Amino acid sequence: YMSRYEEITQQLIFSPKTWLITGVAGFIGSNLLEKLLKLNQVVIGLDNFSTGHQYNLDEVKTLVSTEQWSRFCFIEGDIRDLTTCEQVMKGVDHVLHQAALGSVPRSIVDPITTNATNITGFLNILHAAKNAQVQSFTYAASSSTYGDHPALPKVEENIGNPLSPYAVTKYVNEIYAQVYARTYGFKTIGLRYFNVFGRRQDPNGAYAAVIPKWTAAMLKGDDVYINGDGETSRDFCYIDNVIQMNILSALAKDSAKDNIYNVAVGDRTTLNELSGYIYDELNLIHHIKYREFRSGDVRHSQADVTKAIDLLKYRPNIKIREGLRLSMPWYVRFLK
Amino acid sequence: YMSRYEEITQQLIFSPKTWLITGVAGFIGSNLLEKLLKLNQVVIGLDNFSTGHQYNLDEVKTLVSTEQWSRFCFIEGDIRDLTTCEQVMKGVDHVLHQAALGSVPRSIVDPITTNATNITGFLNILHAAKNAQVQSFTYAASSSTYGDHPALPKVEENIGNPLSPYAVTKYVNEIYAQVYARTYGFKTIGLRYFNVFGRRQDPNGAYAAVIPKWTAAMLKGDDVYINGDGETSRDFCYIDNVIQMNILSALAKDSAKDNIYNVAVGDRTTLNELSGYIYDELNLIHHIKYREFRSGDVRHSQADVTKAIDLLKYRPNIKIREGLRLSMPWYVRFLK
Ligand SMILES: NC(=O)c1ccc[n+]([C@@H]2O[C@H](COP(=O)([O-])OP(=O)(O)OC[C@H]3O[C@@H](n4cnc5c(N)ncnc54)[C@H](O)[C@@H]3O)[C@@H](O)[C@H]2O)c1
Ligand SMILES: NC(=O)c1ccc[n+]([C@@H]2O[C@H](COP(=O)([O-])OP(=O)(O)OC[C@H]3O[C@@H](n4cnc5c(N)ncnc54)[C@H](O)[C@@H]3O)[C@@H](O)[C@H]2O)c1
Ligand SMILES: CC(=O)C[C@H]1[C@@H](OP(=O)(O)OP(=O)(O)OC[C@H]2O[C@@H](n3ccc(=O)[nH]c3=O)[C@H](O)[C@@H]2O)O[C@H](CO)[C@H](O)[C@@H]1O
Ligand SMILES: CC(=O)C[C@H]1[C@@H](OP(=O)(O)OP(=O)(O)OC[C@H]2O[C@@H](n3ccc(=O)[nH]c3=O)[C@H](O)[C@@H]2O)O[C@H](CO)[C@H](O)[C@@H]1O
Ligand code: NA
């Protein structure tokens, strides 16, 4: 049971607030939309359809009431444009900032646009939100911020050096939000995601995340690619934990704000294990080559989530396997 | 004597290089222009006359030969523009990146623009330089990166939380710089500036630094404003020391790159004391109120410069009193 989360969502269905989801056509963004619309919440959406998709918002309209869908006001626009950020904040209570160009590799190959989106775009929104005096400001941060710190599990106080531009930007994000707290009193919540997967994560692109990429590959009957040895271990996190975390961070009390929280499950799964999980969770619905390490890529990842458990009462209920089983059917429909 | 510097300055007079000075129309930039042009160097300059001044360039040309000046290719442009950044690098050997927006209060009032220039504009220079495969990359960093860390003097490995948007932007320059070494092999040198004063530091504007502000007001007879009790202390660093620092960094060995150095003298001077010095050095050329602290204000500042001494062979030869003596006549002249 996601106890506190449930309570917090009851509050929401009672006093609906106006939410801003930057990156709303994205994987996490669109999921927050689906949840938030079902919570009878008025959602202002912002997205420029870079990695995001019409077919995500389109999908969400499939899954919410007509009455609920009319509470959604989509805006096509750019967090890089400050004005846009100011337009969208009007009347907003809670800001769920999810818009960025993730991918460690992308950042290495184009750190310039990455910077514009992940830093400029982040600061623009952060500032627009402050000036609007929104009630909450929760932003997507990243577990790559840990960088080269050797310790496991990964605890918040304990970050090392960044290994990619992408890490820099997300670390920069975290830095600004502290400065905005210290100098403006604008208390925010950073969410250090660890490899979120689930419904609407893009299986296509050179920058596809492991889980969808490999799923797509098995469904086409193509080769499944393993970068390095395969023992590269990760804390995979089903979207519902992320959705949970955002909402809990939106309505966190003041004393738990100006804080970064690992969003994961505390589990550690290597790529050799995962490939097994996916194959097994896919063959239940009726249907491999090793290469060199990705550069900039962190070696091991396992989240310590006790902070979220303690301060926000986050209960990560869905582990990797349970989440994969919840995820496959969506990919089957999306790729048939 | 500034011995290694003497040696390196000669090395230039004989085999001059192409330098890029970003923020060449400004305090540190124009001084670097003057030193490099006097050394017969080829210099591409970049500046958008935001805080910089045409009068600064106008002054420099007065101080150098017409043939020395004809080796200055000034380009009016913004560093936020990636294209311009790439253009100016054509044929550059050494990059002296000083193009940024200082002033902690400026960033508190407008973090967006400070970000734009100091992070976006920096990354553009760094990225363009890396792609131009320039010989040296030296950027102006800041003692404000030390943030809340209580150490004194301030050594380079020991930093705390940034206390302002400005402090962030500068920290991020170092962080970007490191990542670039790690991921591209592009080794840079970051110069942590501690309160640089001297010829051509702007005495006007709301964001005038203390010395030109107080000197401007002691020649007008204006009230001298002290922010705080008066015991707030700085490591005041005359320009020549910075210039030494920038040239030493440019022709430093590979082993001494991907490194950050404090630029200062190593001395500690309080505002109560500074005020005494400025008065005494101005009355040697023939001519006070207390208020509350600056927010984002670091209380004490002093550099440990021993790293720079060991690795670059730096010699902080000009202390605060001697520096003021060389600065004053300029301010007398620039204002009369
Ligand atoms: N993939 C992960 O599990 C993970 C891990 C750590 C951090 N993050 C960060 O959290 C968010 C991840 O969300 P996702 O996995 O759904 O990513 P995603 O690829 O679905 O993209 C998120 C959305 O941001 C939008 N966007 C990008 N740039 C924009 C801009 N300039 N203006 C407006 N919208 C823009 C995209 O179009 C997309 O709709 C990103 O901010 C990412 O950097 C993700
Ligand atoms: N002197 C100090 O007290 C001090 C202390 C710490 C750091 N610094 C750093 O030294 C560098 C310059 O300092 P300064 O004292 O010469 O200040 P300055 O204002 O004299 O110089 C800044 C120069 O940057 C140029 N510039 C600003 N934005 C630009 C842009 N977008 N594109 C191109 N040019 C742009 C301005 O025209 C100006 O000439 C900056 O990195 C500053 O943060 C100075
Ligand atoms: C530990 C982190 O830094 C995790 C952050 C980081 O997520 P990540 O670990 O890069 O996710 P990925 O699914 O992309 O890679 C899976 C692994 O298998 C490798 N990989 C990938 C694809 C493939 O087909 N085969 C493969 O072996 C791949 O090189 C890697 O070794 O970037 C995310 C958003 O950009 C987010 O910040 C995460 O928190
Ligand atoms: C330790 C740092 O933070 C150093 C960075 C940081 O330098 P700084 O110390 O803010 O600059 P200043 O010379 O302006 O203030 C000196 C003292 O005079 C006091 N001050 C100032 C003006 C005045 O009228 N009266 C007064 O008392 C004021 O309260 C303050 O206590 O900002 C610089 C601007 O780019 C630069 O980046 C430095 O590296
Ligand atoms: Na708040």
Counting one residue from A and one from B, how many pairs have CB atoms under 8 Å apart? 75
In Å, how far are A58, A118, A239, A326, A330 from A216, measured between CA atoms? 21, 28, 19, 16, 11
Determine, for residues A112 and B124 on separate chains, whether the beta-carbon distance falls below 8 Å.
yes
* Contact between residue A252 and residue A189 where contact means Cβ atoms under 8 Å apart: yes
User: Is there an atom of ligand 4 within 6 Å of B102 CB?
Assistant: yes
> Is B216 near chain A, with CB under 8 Å?
no
* Contact between residue A32 and residue A58 where contact means Cβ atoms under 8 Å apart: no
The reply to whether A87 and A200 lie within a common domain is no
d(CA B178, CA A182): 26
The reply to whether B149 and B217 lie within a common domain is no
* Contact between residue B164 and residue B297 where contact means Cβ atoms under 8 Å apart: no
* SS3 state of residue B148: coil
Tokens of B175: 């962080």
Angle, CA of B312, B315 and B316, to the nearest 5°: 125
CA trace torsion B229, B230, B232, B236 (10° rounding): 170
d(CA A124, CA A122): 5
Helix (H) or strand (E) holding B326: helix B320-335
The reply to whether A82 and A225 lie within a common domain is no
Look-up of token digits 């992940």:
A118
CB contact burial A257-288 (16+ within 10 A = b; e otherwise): bbbbbbbbbbbbbebeebbebbbebbeeeeee
- In the chain, the amino acid numbered A148 is D
Helical packing angle, B239-250 and B320-335, nearest 10°? 110
3-state SS string for chain A? CCHHHHHHHHHHHHCCCEEEEECCCCHHHHHHHHHHHHCCCEEEEEECCCCCCHHHHHHHHHHCCHHHHCCEEEEECCCCCHHHHHHHHCCCCEEEECCCCCCHHHHHHCHHHHHHHHHHHHHHHHHHHHHHCCCEEEEEEEHHHHCCCCCCCECCCCCCCCCCHHHHHHHHHHHHHHHHHHHHCCCCEEEEECCEECCCCCCCCCCCCHHHHHHHHHHHCCCCEEECCCCCEECCEEHHHHHHHHHHHHCCCHHHCCEEEEECCCCCEEHHHHHHHHHHHHHCCCCCEEECCCCCCCCCCCECCHHHHHHCCCCCCCCHHHHHHHHHHHHHHHHC
Give the residue numbers spanning the domain of A298.
Answer: 194-238+265-303+319-336
- Best substitution site from B107, B193, B234 to test ligand 2's pocket, by max atoms within 8 Å of Cβ? B193
The reply to whether A74 and A159 lie within a common domain is yes
The reply to whether A200 and A227 lie within a common domain is yes
> Is B296 near chain A, with CB under 8 Å?
yes
Distinct helix (H) and strand (E) counts, chain B: 14, 13
Tokens of A229: 């040895």
User: Cα B34 vs. chain centroid, distance in angstroms?
Assistant: 14
3-state SS string for A180-216? HHHHHCCCCEEEEECCEECCCCCCCCCCCCHHHHHHH
Q: Report phi then psi at B191, rounded to 5.
A: -105, 105
* SS3 state of residue B45: strand
d(CA B58, CA B63): 9
Resolution (A): 2.9
The reply to whether A171 and A204 lie within a common domain is no
Question: How many angstroms separate the CA of residue A317 from the nearest CA in chain B?
Answer: 34
Question: How many angstroms separate the CA of residue B121 from the nearest CA in chain A?
Answer: 10
d(CA A19, CA B213): 46
Helix (H) or strand (E) holding B272: helix B271-283
Tokens of B151: 């150490």
Question: How many angstroms separate the CA of residue B115 from the nearest CA in chain A?
Answer: 7
Tokens of A78: 């750019």
3-state SS string for A93-117? CEEEECCCCCCHHHHHHCHHHHHHH
Q: Which chain A residues have a beta carbon less than 8 Å from that of B161?
A: 178, 182
The reply to whether A7 and A99 lie within a common domain is yes
Longest CA–CA separation in chain A, Å: 57
The reply to whether B156 and B66 lie within a common domain is yes
In A, minimum Cα distance to B125 occurs at: A112
Q: Which chain B residues have a beta carbon less than 8 Å from that of A296?
A: 183
Tell which residues of chain B come right before a gap with C–N over 2.5 A: 287
Protein residue closest via CA to atom 10 of ligand 4: B104
Q: Report phi then psi at A254, rounded to 5.
A: -55, -45
d(CA B272, CA A64): 67
What is the C-alpha radius of gyration for chain B, rounded to an integer number of angstroms? 19
Return the beta strands (E) in chain B as ranges.
18-22, 42-47, 72-76, 94-97, 136-142, 189-193, 196-197, 225-227, 233-234, 237-238, 259-263, 269-270, 289-291
Cβ of B332: how many Cβ atoms within 10 Å?
15
Q: Report phi then psi at B42, rounded to 5.
A: -85, 130
The reply to whether A230 and A117 lie within a common domain is no
Method of determination?
X-ray
- In the chain, the amino acid numbered A18 is T
* CB-neighbour burial class of residue B35 (10 A; exposed 0-12, middle 13-18, buried 19+): buried
* Contact between residue B328 and residue B281 where contact means Cβ atoms under 8 Å apart: yes
User: Cα A205 vs. chain centroid, distance in angstroms?
Assistant: 18
In Å, how far are A150, A227, A228, A229, B197 from A299, measured between CA atoms? 9, 11, 10, 11, 46
Q: Report phi then psi at B20, rounded to 5.
A: -115, 120
d(CA B324, CA B196): 11
* SS3 state of residue B269: strand
Tokens of A252: 């966190």
* SS3 state of residue B274: helix
The reply to whether B173 and B246 lie within a common domain is yes
Find all residues with CB under 8 Å of B48, minimum gap 6, and list them.
B76, B77, B78, B79, B99
Find all residues with CB under 8 Å of A155, minimum gap 6, and list them.
A262, A304, A307
Tokens of B294: 């600056």
Q: How do strand B259-263 and strand B189-193 relate by DSSP bridges?
A: parallel
The CATH number assigned to the domain holding B56 equals 3.40.50.720
Nearest one of A113, A103, A108, A296 to A208, comparing CA atoms: A103
What is the C-alpha radius of gyration for chain A, rounded to an integer number of angstroms? 19
> Is A108 near chain B, with CB under 8 Å?
yes
Q: Report phi then psi at A123, rounded to 5.
A: -60, -40
> Is B179 near chain A, with CB under 8 Å?
yes
Angle, CA of A327, A330 and A336, to the nearest 5°: 135
d(CA A178, CA B168): 10
The CATH number assigned to the domain holding B218 equals 3.90.25.10
d(CA A59, CA A162): 36
Tokens of B109: 């009032």
d(CA B78, CA B7): 34
In Å, how far are A31, A126, A241, B59, B109 from A265, measured between CA atoms? 18, 28, 8, 63, 40
Cβ of A62: how many Cβ atoms within 10 Å?
8
d(CA A41, CA A6): 15
Which runs of consecutive H residues, i.e. helices, occur in B50-192?
A: 54-63, 66-69, 82-89, 104-109, 111-115, 121-132, 165-184
Determine, for residues B175 and A179 on separate chains, whether the beta-carbon distance falls below 8 Å.
no
Half-sphere exposure of B177 (CA within 13 A, CB side): 24
d(CA A262, CA A153): 11
Q: How many domains does chain A have?
A: 2
d(CA B263, CA B235): 9
The reply to whether B179 and B46 lie within a common domain is yes
The reply to whether A22 and A101 lie within a common domain is yes
Look-up of token digits 């050095």:
B281
In Å, how far are A206, B46, B314 from B21, measured between CA atoms? 38, 6, 21
* Contact between residue B7 and residue B83 where contact means Cβ atoms under 8 Å apart: no
User: Is there an atom of ligand 1 within 6 Å of A55 CB?
Assistant: no
d(CA A333, CA B182): 42
Q: Report phi then psi at B175, rounded to 5.
A: -65, -45
Partners of residue A18 on adjacent β-strands:
A42
Tokens of A209: 């995340």
Q: Is the dihedral of CA B247, B39, B66, B43 positive or negative?
A: negative
d(CA B304, CA B261): 9
- In the chain, the amino acid numbered A103 is S
Kindly give the distance from the C-alpha atom of residue A116 to the centroid of ligand 3, in angstroms, as a whole number.
22
